Design a protein around this motif. Structure first.
Motif, PDB file in Angstrom:
ATOM      1  N   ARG A 195      44.732  39.499  34.565  1.00 20.24           N
ATOM      2  CA  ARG A 195      45.000  40.926  34.679  1.00 20.24           C
ATOM      3  C   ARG A 195      45.123  41.436  33.248  1.00 20.24           C
ATOM      4  O   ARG A 195      46.053  41.051  32.536  1.00 20.24           O
ATOM      5  CB  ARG A 195      46.324  41.118  35.419  1.00 20.24           C
ATOM      6  CG  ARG A 195      46.812  42.561  35.512  1.00 20.24           C
ATOM      7  CD  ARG A 195      47.948  42.882  34.533  1.00 20.24           C
ATOM      8  NE  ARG A 195      48.389  44.267  34.703  1.00 20.24           N
ATOM      9  CZ  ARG A 195      49.093  44.953  33.805  1.00 20.24           C
ATOM     10  NH1 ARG A 195      49.463  44.389  32.665  1.00 20.24           N
ATOM     11  NH2 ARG A 195      49.430  46.211  34.055  1.00 20.24           N
ATOM     12  N   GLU A 233      43.565  46.649  33.864  1.00 21.96           N
ATOM     13  CA  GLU A 233      44.487  47.743  34.133  1.00 21.96           C
ATOM     14  C   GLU A 233      43.989  48.969  33.388  1.00 21.96           C
ATOM     15  O   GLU A 233      44.154  49.086  32.169  1.00 21.96           O
ATOM     16  CB  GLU A 233      45.909  47.412  33.700  1.00 21.96           C
ATOM     17  CG  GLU A 233      46.849  48.548  34.113  1.00 21.96           C
ATOM     18  CD  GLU A 233      48.020  48.807  33.177  1.00 21.96           C
ATOM     19  OE1 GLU A 233      47.980  48.424  31.985  1.00 21.96           O
ATOM     20  OE2 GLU A 233      49.001  49.432  33.656  1.00 21.96           O
ATOM     21  N   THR A 254      41.838  48.144  38.230  1.00 25.32           N
ATOM     22  CA  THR A 254      42.941  48.648  39.041  1.00 25.32           C
ATOM     23  C   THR A 254      42.655  50.076  39.474  1.00 25.32           C
ATOM     24  O   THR A 254      42.419  50.954  38.638  1.00 25.32           O
ATOM     25  CB  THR A 254      44.220  48.667  38.197  1.00 25.32           C
ATOM     26  OG1 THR A 254      43.979  49.419  36.992  1.00 25.32           O
ATOM     27  CG2 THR A 254      44.669  47.259  37.824  1.00 25.32           C
ATOM     28  N   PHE A 256      44.460  53.007  40.591  1.00 29.45           N
ATOM     29  CA  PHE A 256      45.747  53.663  40.787  1.00 29.45           C
ATOM     30  C   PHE A 256      45.672  54.849  41.750  1.00 29.45           C
ATOM     31  O   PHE A 256      46.702  55.264  42.294  1.00 29.45           O
ATOM     32  CB  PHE A 256      46.325  54.084  39.436  1.00 29.45           C
ATOM     33  CG  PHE A 256      46.938  52.951  38.665  1.00 29.45           C
ATOM     34  CD1 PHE A 256      46.155  52.116  37.870  1.00 29.45           C
ATOM     35  CD2 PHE A 256      48.302  52.699  38.766  1.00 29.45           C
ATOM     36  CE1 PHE A 256      46.729  51.063  37.174  1.00 29.45           C
ATOM     37  CE2 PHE A 256      48.880  51.645  38.073  1.00 29.45           C
ATOM     38  CZ  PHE A 256      48.098  50.826  37.281  1.00 29.45           C
ATOM     39  N   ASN A 298      53.038  48.859  41.526  1.00 33.91           N
ATOM     40  CA  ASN A 298      53.083  47.806  40.518  1.00 33.91           C
ATOM     41  C   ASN A 298      54.418  47.887  39.777  1.00 33.91           C
ATOM     42  O   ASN A 298      55.287  48.718  40.090  1.00 33.91           O
ATOM     43  CB  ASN A 298      51.853  47.826  39.591  1.00 33.91           C
ATOM     44  CG  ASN A 298      51.915  48.915  38.533  1.00 33.91           C
ATOM     45  OD1 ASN A 298      52.769  49.806  38.581  1.00 33.91           O
ATOM     46  ND2 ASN A 298      51.005  48.843  37.558  1.00 33.91           N
ATOM     47  N   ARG A 338      46.369  43.293  46.126  1.00 35.82           N
ATOM     48  CA  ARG A 338      47.485  42.629  45.470  1.00 35.82           C
ATOM     49  C   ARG A 338      48.781  43.215  46.023  1.00 35.82           C
ATOM     50  O   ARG A 338      48.932  44.441  46.101  1.00 35.82           O
ATOM     51  CB  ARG A 338      47.416  42.857  43.956  1.00 35.82           C
ATOM     52  CG  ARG A 338      48.550  42.189  43.179  1.00 35.82           C
ATOM     53  CD  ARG A 338      48.530  42.563  41.701  1.00 35.82           C
ATOM     54  NE  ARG A 338      48.810  43.984  41.508  1.00 35.82           N
ATOM     55  CZ  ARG A 338      48.550  44.670  40.394  1.00 35.82           C
ATOM     56  NH1 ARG A 338      48.006  44.072  39.348  1.00 35.82           N
ATOM     57  NH2 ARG A 338      48.837  45.970  40.318  1.00 35.82           N
TER      58      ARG A 338
HETATM   59 CL   LIG Z   1      48.442  46.582  37.132  1.00 41.82          CL
END
Ligand SMILES: [Cl-]
Ligand SMILES: [Ca+2]
Length: 496
Positions: A195, A233, A254, A256, A298, A338
């Protein structure tokens, strides 16, 4: 060109878990539980040497300030890290490292978790070694304080300092070589992927150059000729000059927007309706599922650092809604899922900001971390909640089937199946619903896996509230009696 967005799992496993601030010895033990519940892997906190911050005392965020690329961290020693990777890999539960490549520390001086010096004022990191030539500086950033302020300026976002974190020059051959050596050492020990922290603050071309230096996965466990799994990310909720779509050619990103949207929907913020999820996914203006790493919350945004602050993201503090959102995410077909796994802390929101958002993991003091004991008021262990792990089983049983037999109440009730494998009825209304639907499932006797232990009788009542058996009729229809309230959902699926 090498692509890093494909991950590798044992058959019947897919979902990964962020064991945030867990020690290596605890993750090593947890891999047995995770394997038994058919999770695919674990994202681990930054394992390299990081800053030790004593004012305030040992915050979680000290781990996002690298001091060197040695492997002694708050979670344990290099020996403990390697024991964890070996044991977990042997169980078929893989390890993704939280890799912090954009920056070193902020200002000030001290030592890291392995005893090496840092000095953010002189830019000296002798444990690497890095010096001033390895960083962006006044030649590269023209803001008055050297920090990022204008998110419509990609050069500023990438070459200035995120909140003062000294910003590495990712265009430099030496920095690229050093960071690839770190990643390759971990790959050689058996790490399956990374990550990558703070990727919006790095240039995709610099990431491409680093990834091009990587060795392939260790064939003691992984297929020959396989690249590491990379998910990046990139915080992108729209309306900025850096875009998640710049990074998908290298690996997954990722998304979001996913947790923002699901949070708003399940909370019914600003007149949102669960029925709007009929087309949830890429069509909401999100990344394609194949490019996306998805999650409800997260470690950053459960502390109010995402957009909307504390008013949108769902977390274990809103447990009933959080389980609804997570169940939907696991039953749907969109992205690599995740699950966060959290610790408790004295969240204390004042003027929209948690004054205690710095607090580190459960500790007796001295910067150590306690052994995990799930459900003790300190370790939340969301991945061990029955509503989560039974929906992971649902997700595994449903894999590869389309969304089918969608239904909704125009408003806050939806239902859908996954081929002939599973069906979930979600009643997010403030009243009970009795509804017969084509479930797509073979006729028979099913148990609600949200409330019961098993998918068929005997249903298993370890939680104490296992609902009455759901009868699917010979035509594939079933009558769902779903009261509103706690766990206001029924999920049924065929035998694994
Ligand atoms: Cl993350
Ligand atoms: Ca940068």
């Amino acid at each position: 060109f090498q692509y890093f967005g494909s991950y590798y799992c044992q058959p019947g496993r897919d979902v990964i878990v962020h064991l945030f601030e867990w020690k290596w010895t605890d993750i090593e033990r947890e891999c047995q539980w995770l394997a038994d519940h058919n999770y695919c892997g674990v994202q681990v906190s930054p394992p390299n040497e990081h800053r030790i911050v004593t004012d305030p005392p040992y915050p979680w965020w000290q781990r996002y300030q690298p001091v060197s690329y040695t492997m002694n961290s708050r979670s344990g020693s290099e020996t403990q890290f390697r024991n964890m990777v070996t044991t977990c890999n042997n169980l078929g539960v893989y390890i993704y490292v939280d890799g912090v490549l954009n920056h070193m520390t902020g200002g000030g001086s001290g030592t890291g978790s392995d005893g090496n010096s840092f000095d953010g004022d002189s830019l000296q990191y002798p444990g690497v070694p890095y010096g001033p030539n390895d960083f962006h500086g006044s030649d590269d950033c023209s803001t008055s304080d050297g920090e990022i302020h204008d998110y419509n300026n990609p050069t500023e976002v990438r070459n200035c300092r995120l909140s003062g974190l000294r910003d590495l020059d990712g265009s430099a051959n030496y920095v690229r070589d050093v960071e690839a050596e770190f990643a390759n050492r971990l790959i050689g020990w058996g790490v399956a992927g990374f990550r990558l922290d703070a990727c919006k603050h790095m240039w995709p071309g610099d990431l491409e150059a680093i990834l091009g230096r990587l060795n392939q996965l260790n064939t003691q466990w992984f297929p020959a000729g396989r690249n590491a799994y990379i998910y990046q990310e990139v915080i992108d909720l729209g309306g900025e000059a850096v875009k998640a779509t710049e990074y998908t050619y290298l690996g997954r990103v990722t998304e979001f927007k996913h947790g923002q949207n699901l949070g708003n929907v399940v909370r019914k913020n600003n007149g949102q309706r669960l029925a709007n999820l009929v087309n949830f996914g890429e069509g909401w203006g999100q990344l394609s599922g194949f490019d996306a790493l998805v999650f409800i919350d997260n470690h950053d945004n459960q502390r109010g650092h995402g957009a909307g602050g504390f008013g949108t993201i769902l977390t274990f503090f809103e447990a009933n809604m959080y389980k609804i959102a997570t169940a939907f995410e696991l039953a749907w077909d969109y992205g690599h899922v995740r699950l966060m796994s959290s610790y408790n802390w004295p969240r204390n929101i004042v003027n929209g900001v948690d004054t205690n958002d710095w607090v580190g993991p459960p500790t007796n003091g001295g910067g150590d971390t306690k052994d995990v004991e799930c459900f003790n008021g300190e370790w939340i262990c969301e991945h061990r909640w029955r509503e989560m792990y039974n929906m992971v089983r649902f997700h595994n049983v449903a894999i590869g089937n389309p969304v089918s037999n969608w239904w909704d109440n125009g408003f806050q009730a939806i239902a859908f199946g996954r081929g002939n494998r599973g069906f979930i009825f979600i009643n997010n209304e403030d009243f009970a619903i009795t509804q017969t639907l084509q479930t797509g499932l073979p006729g028979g006797e099913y148990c609600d896996v949200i409330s019961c232990d098993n998918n068929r009788p005997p249903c298993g009542n370890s939680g104490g509230a296992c609902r009455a058996t759901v009868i699917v009729n010979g035509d594939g229809t079933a009558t769902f009696d779903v009261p509103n309230g706690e766990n206001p959902m029924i999920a049924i699926h065929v035998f694994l």
